[PDB]
Amino acid sequence: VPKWIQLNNEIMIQKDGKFQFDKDKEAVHSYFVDYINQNTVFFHNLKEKLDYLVENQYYEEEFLSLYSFEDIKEVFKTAYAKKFRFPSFMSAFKFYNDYALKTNDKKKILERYEDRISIVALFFANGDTEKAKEYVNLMINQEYQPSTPTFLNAGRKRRGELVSCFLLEVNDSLNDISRAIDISMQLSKLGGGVSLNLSKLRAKGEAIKDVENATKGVVGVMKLLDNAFRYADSGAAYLNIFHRDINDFLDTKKISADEDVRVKTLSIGVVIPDKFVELAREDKAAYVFYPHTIYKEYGQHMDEMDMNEMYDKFVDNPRVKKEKINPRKLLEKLAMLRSESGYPYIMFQDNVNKVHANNHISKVKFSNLCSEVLQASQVSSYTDYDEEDEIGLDISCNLGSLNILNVMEHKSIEKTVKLATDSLTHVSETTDIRNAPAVRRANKAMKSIGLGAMNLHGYLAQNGIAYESPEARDFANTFFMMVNFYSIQRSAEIAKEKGETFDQYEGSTYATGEYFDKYVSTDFSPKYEKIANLFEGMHIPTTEDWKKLKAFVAEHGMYHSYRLCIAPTGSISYVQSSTASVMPIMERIEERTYGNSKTYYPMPGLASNNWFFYKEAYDMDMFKVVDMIATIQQHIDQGISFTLFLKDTMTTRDLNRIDLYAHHRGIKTIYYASCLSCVV
Amino acid sequence: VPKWIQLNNEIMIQKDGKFQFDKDKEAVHSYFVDYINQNTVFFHNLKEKLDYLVENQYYEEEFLSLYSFEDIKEVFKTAYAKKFRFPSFMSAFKFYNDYALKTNDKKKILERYEDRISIVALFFANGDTEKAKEYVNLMINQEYQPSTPTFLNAGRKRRGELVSCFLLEVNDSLNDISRAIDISMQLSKLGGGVSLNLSKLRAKGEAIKDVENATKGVVGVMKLLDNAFRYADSGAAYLNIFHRDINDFLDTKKISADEDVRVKTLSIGVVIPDKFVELAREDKAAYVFYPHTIYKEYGQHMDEMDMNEMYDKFVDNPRVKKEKINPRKLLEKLAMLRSESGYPYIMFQDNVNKVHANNHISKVKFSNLCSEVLQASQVSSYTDYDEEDEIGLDISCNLGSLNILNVMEHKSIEKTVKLATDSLTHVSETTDIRNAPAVRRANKAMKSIGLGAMNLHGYLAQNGIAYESPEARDFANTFFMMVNFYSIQRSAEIAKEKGETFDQYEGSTYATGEYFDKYVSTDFSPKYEKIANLFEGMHIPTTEDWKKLKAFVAEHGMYHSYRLCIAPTGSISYVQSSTASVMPIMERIEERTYGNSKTYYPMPGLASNNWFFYKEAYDMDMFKVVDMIATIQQHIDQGISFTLFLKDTMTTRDLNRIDLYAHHRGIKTIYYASCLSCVV
Numbered sequence A, B: 001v002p003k004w005i006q007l008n009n010e011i012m013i014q015k016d017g018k019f020q021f022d023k024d025k026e027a028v029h030s031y032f033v034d035y036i037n038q039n040t041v042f043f044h045n046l047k048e049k050l051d052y053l054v055e056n057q058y059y060e061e062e063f064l065s066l067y068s069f070e071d072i073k074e075v076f077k078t079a080y081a082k083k084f085r086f087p088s089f090m091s092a093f094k095f096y097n098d099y100a101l102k103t104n105d106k107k108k109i110l111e112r113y114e115d116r117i118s119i120v121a122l123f124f125a126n127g128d129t130e131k132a133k134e135y136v137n138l139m140i141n142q143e144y145q146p147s148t149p150t151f152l153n154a155g156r157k158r159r160g161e162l163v164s165c166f167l168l169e170v171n172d173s174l175n176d177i178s179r180a181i182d183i184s185m186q187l188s189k190l191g192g193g194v195s196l197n198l199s200k201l202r203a204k205g206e207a208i209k210d211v212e213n214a215t216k217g218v219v220g221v222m223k224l225l226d227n228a229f230r231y232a233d234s235g236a237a238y239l240n241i242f243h244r245d246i247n248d249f250l251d252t253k254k255i256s257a258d259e260d261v262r263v264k265t266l267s268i269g270v271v272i273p274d275k276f277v278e279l280a281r282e283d284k285a286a287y288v289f290y291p292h293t294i295y296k297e298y299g300q301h302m303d304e305m306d307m308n309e310m311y312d313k314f315v316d317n318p319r320v321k322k323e324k325i326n327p328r329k330l331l332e333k334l335a336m337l338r339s340e341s342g343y344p345y346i347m348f349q350d351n352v353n354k355v356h357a358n359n360h361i362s363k364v365k366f367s368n369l370c371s372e373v374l375q376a377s378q379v380s381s382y383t384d385y386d387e388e389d390e391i392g393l394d395i396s397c398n399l400g401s402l403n404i405l406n407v408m409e410h411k412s413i414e415k416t417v418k419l420a421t422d423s424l425t426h427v428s429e430t431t432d433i434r435n436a437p438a439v440r441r442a443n444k445a446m447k448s449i450g451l452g453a454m455n456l457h458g459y460l461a462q463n464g465i466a467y468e469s470p471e472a473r474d475f476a477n478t479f480f481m482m483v484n485f486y487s488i489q490r491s492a493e494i495a496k497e498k499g500e501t502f503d504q505y506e507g508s509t510y511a512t513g514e515y516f517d518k519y520v521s522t523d524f525s526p527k528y529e530k531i532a533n534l535f536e537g538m539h540i541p542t543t544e545d546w547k548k549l550k551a552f553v554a555e556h557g558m559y560h561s562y563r564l565c566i567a568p569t570g571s572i573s574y575v576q577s578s579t580a581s582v583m584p585i586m587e588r589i590e591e592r593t594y595g596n597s598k599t600y601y602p603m604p605g606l607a608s609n610n611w612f613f614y615k616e617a618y619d620m621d622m623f624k625v626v627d628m629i630a631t632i633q634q635h636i637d638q639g640i641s642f643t644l645f646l647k648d649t650m651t652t653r654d655l656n657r658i659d660l661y662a663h664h665r666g667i668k669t670i671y672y673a674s675c676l677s678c679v680v
């Protein structure tokens, strides 16, 4: 058993009662000098390294060719100038086991951390050598982390798609179902996670033409999708809670389910308008609807109408077919299923669209895997083979997360947010998906990105602030207001520079101006002195700066229809020495076994004299955690991946009280603690 | 219990030992006077009937509008002039329960047998009132029976496709698999039976791009197809026996199969070149091949190359990957599976293509459900969404069967064959399938039809000839030679009249002339005096008439790439008072229960003094039955649906001896005794 593993397990052998947290600095030193350093191919020079990597199909050629090799050498030297040392064993382990380029035979390391960062920065900068240096520092300071699809692939031959997160609308016809099956498979062969809105399909037992009682309904299309995802080497289906098939749709995921209905590779999510929550609160018997009878009567997809305005009219219209259900028992059933499987992802639709900027394009109708992406969409119609299709707007999103601790310690909220936006914008412009025409069309027209944040708990706990305190909410209120400020500002700058906006920008609340109402009348500077000191050295936007930005946006518009969303962070959390996303930590010390050995990872920064501040999530009050997320969500234009952390000692009514409280506080999406393609 | 059922069961109460065969004439009289006649809507006049049926969406309007109502009345009167009486209870039962148009609420009969026949004849004739009368007599004399898709639908609103039999090629890409899934579903929603050739898909464990060992293989695509056929309200997959996946492909249909592999709605068929039979005879270890390694090496689909010429070259080529198998044990496994499920359909490919007329278009590579359709085909390539597709040639076939007994007693081999061809040609020209571009293209280009025959055993047994005798083979040799003669003659006539041929006709053996070699040098007039007397009154073509037809075809060409094939006959066998297809009968008297009552159907014509001639199939020598089919097959340009009738007392080696003997005699396809869409 290796020496680095030796020192690693010595953390758990207590000294003066204390753990041996410093042993892990030894373990990662041992892991390099006695292993990594000896399986890293080392070349006589960089040109020899790069020439080898281009000539052997490891790297791509075009992006490097945009630079003079004297400039490529300066960029690499910038990365190595940091003298970056991993502070823990598992952080270095996760980079070399999951991200570092290895040889085709997988026996030696071709990339150090500085090499992958230099290649990504050379790709983002697209010829601008100084910008590449700017990107190298931002990544080697660990201020920004592009998503794993982007961070892993950039500059590689045999490179997978930089974007791996997709959402699809499906129209109510056999042509459209067949095309969604193929798009699902085409995106999935590229490694994408695909989420499909099934709310427009007609329900079980609806007419086809004049044959009554002929439709298989939503579950039939889930069976076909489940199979498509099996064949092509993970997907999701969303359903509106007022769809008649909602119960059958949920039942496909009971672990006890029969195999006549069992769907096994599909996540599910449920979309809940306000009208449902009112009906469940009132314990009033509610109706769910056969969507095609609504279509034949109103000429519109039920999915495209406002259920808060239309519910009573649908109930009274005799040509609309409906079914009675118990809303409380359905709500309880959602709590049960989430205990089984984490999902169904719950989306509070009116909490999304109350503050949505682009309802003019459409209401937000569904979300992606782990449910942080919230964008407008319009269904296509794929017509008969001899006829022209009508291409709508699907959704794809390009993700990255800034690292809150290093952004605060570098006092670089503005510079990081603007640079990371530039990088996400470059990934969006170099994407061309084939065989998914509405994804391709929406990416050019909407130009949407998703910048997030990680290390919230880590940063708070290392500055003596409990995750559940009002001080923590006061830090989050200001920090994410500032992120949003410079994000909007950089998007308007790019709009002025390029002279374009996203298509139909002028219909958005950014153009009509009401997006800015709370920012020009309410101050978001800290209410607590100790929190305000954290921001010393950085200007905090006032209502006057917001007024001038409102005016700026009014003149130049905006390049991006959406900018911010907080995805989960996977393995890369280790590499960044960062607590996952904006969630509280789950364990103070993780014990995981790898190859007949046990490894220990204490939370980034865990010391004996801050132990109290790394409070484990399952011991926290979820009603206070909801308060924190609702605070961040004010300043995030899309969504926040939000897992509740619950003891099995929770009654089904305690669970629904959390649900109702989340809804009350304006939370957009929620589930309980397969998303791999849609995580940073 | 009704009176017709009363008299019906009295057949089985013996008199002087004899059965009471005449009771069934009473039973069908009782069934009319005491039931059918009282649930038939009767109108004051025909115009009142027709106007009702057009105004209430029962009938279509366009085809009737091509006639003056004075002519529609003459055609109907022609049908009723026959005074057609069903000779048995079950024959009338099957027409009114399965074919006669009932009201939308299914409570009364809108069509007598004379009405359905008049409507079909008005449709076939397409305005030619005299031709409609010709069609009415041919159908009411029960000389010709169009297939159930055609006979049931013609002239109806909400009418299904007249053709319901389709065969598809599938190319080796995800694009093509997705398109085959959609075509399968589009054809299947129209009621079609769909057969797909899977021999071009690469095998389990082949490369995708440069990822080695990445393919799911043929079984993965069967799982998706199985699901497509489930969703859309029966299909078949064919595989060449030299495909590496052959064993896994067969195993999906073991009744004991695991549900990780179980395919439940798909028939299967196996395509066997001569080289395999030689290898199994020699008990020599044989190889099966990974098709993509052959493609990467030879630039051609293994499916498109001649395995008899290429086998040894494939084995020696080191860049071709193969696997060893035991051919005898594989042959035995085919016998086992056919005992379980009737299928896999076996196709002896070189027996098909030795005599195929259009190898210039392609070799025949596979067949349909119940395996009588044998036509050339060329695979499409459905490319990326933004790119043009390359449309090949799929197959669809329009079926009908003449009724041998009534054709002989009317001495009308020529008139029936030529008229039935006209009708099948009209169904082909009025088909336009959407969402299946290679089916649509091949139907216009190939103009293929499939005219068959029924009542072979019935006719033989009623003329004192045993199905297994050399006299019976001598009658079949002549009768089907004459069918083929007038079929080719009428196709050449239509070619002269229209001035067209099927596309690329001049490459066929009809054009180069060698199709006719045996007919200009061998005489097919009867060798037995008693058989020759059966043909008295009809001219039997001589080698001189064949020489003049050869010359005729040479000048005018041919309209149809294929003309003859003998499908099974389903329920319509009852309506025609006919033994099924060209098969021997299975039971002298069928006992079936319907609605708490037992019904008896003696074979059409079964009398006590011909009992010996209605020998039951399971008591016959299958080696003699093979001899009969091989005799008919000489004069049929496509195939003959051929079920072996076997006792469970057959060793697995007895079964393979039949297989080898069928192959020896030139049989094209065979299986053991779901085809509903591809039966007359």
Ligand SMILES: Nc1ncnc2c1ncn2[C@@H]1O[C@H](COP(=O)(O)OP(=O)(O)OP(=O)(O)O)[C@@H](O)[C@H]1O
Pocket: A041, A042, A043, A044, A045, A046, A047, A049, A073, A076, A077, A078, A080, A115
């Ligand atoms: N395998 C490798 N071998 C050598 N340098 C590498 C390799 N991988 C990355 N580099 C980086 O390339 C940069 C330039 O490397 P190189 O060895 O060519 O120059 P040097 O000898 O250090 O300095 P100079 O180019 O001024 O002589 C350095 O920052 C080095 O860390």
Ligand SMILES: Nc1ncnc2c1ncn2[C@@H]1O[C@H](COP(=O)(O)OP(=O)(O)OP(=O)(O)O)[C@@H](O)[C@H]1O
Pocket: B041, B042, B043, B044, B045, B046, B047, B049, B073, B076, B077, B078, B080, B115
């Ligand atoms: N429901 C029906 N009522 C009447 N005739 C029908 C009906 N269905 C079919 N027919 C057929 O329509 C044909 C013409 O029928 P119709 O009753 O109009 O004429 P008719 O009185 O028998 O003779 P004519 O037209 O010379 O007076 C007949 O052959 C009849 O069998």
Ligand SMILES: Cc1cn([C@H]2C[C@H](O)[C@@H](COP(=O)(O)OP(=O)(O)OP(=O)(O)O)O2)c(=O)[nH]c1=O
Pocket: A172, A173, A174, A175, A177, A201, A202, A207, A208, A209, A210, A214, A215, A216, A217, A220, B189, B231, B232, B233
């Ligand atoms: C063909 C078919 C469709 N469907 C579903 C798919 C769609 O959600 C829905 C409608 O299919 P469509 O393909 O739109 O049918 P249609 O256009 O012929 O008829 P209509 O005018 O009523 O739309 O029915 C089935 O459930 N089973 C089937 O076999």
Ligand SMILES: Cc1cn([C@H]2C[C@H](O)[C@@H](COP(=O)(O)OP(=O)(O)OP(=O)(O)O)O2)c(=O)[nH]c1=O
Pocket: A189, A231, A232, A233, B172, B173, B174, B175, B177, B201, B202, B207, B208, B209, B210, B214, B215, B216, B217, B220
């Ligand atoms: C994408 C994909 C294809 N396949 C099968 C379908 C086809 O039979 C075969 C090839 O798929 P293709 O779609 O043709 O793949 P490709 O063109 O990218 O690669 P190549 O040049 O090697 O053709 O692989 C799978 O088995 N699983 C998959 O996930």
Ligand SMILES: Nc1ncnc2c1ncn2[C@@H]1O[C@H](COP(=O)(O)OP(=O)(O)O)[C@@H](O)[C@H]1O
Pocket: A028, A029, A032, A033, A037, A084, A085, A086, A087, A092
């Ligand atoms: N924690 C670490 N993170 C990254 N690289 C490391 C780490 N520890 C050791 N290495 C690598 O191993 C080399 C040998 O380590 P060492 O000689 O102890 O440090 P230094 O070179 O700073 O004196 C370092 O130069 C470095 O490239």
Ligand SMILES: Nc1ncnc2c1ncn2[C@@H]1O[C@H](COP(=O)(O)OP(=O)(O)O)[C@@H](O)[C@H]1O
Pocket: B028, B029, B032, B033, B037, B084, B085, B086, B087, B092
């Ligand atoms: N075997 C049968 N096949 C068809 N129709 C029949 C049959 N038996 C009776 N019918 C119908 O019932 C009617 C009443 O029968 P019946 O009066 O016995 O015969 P007919 O009218 O020839 O004297 C017939 O006109 C005929 O339309």
Ligand SMILES: [Mg+2]
Pocket: A172, A173, A174
């Ligand atoms: Mg439709």
Ligand SMILES: [Mg+2]
Pocket: B172, B173, B174
């Ligand atoms: Mg390919």
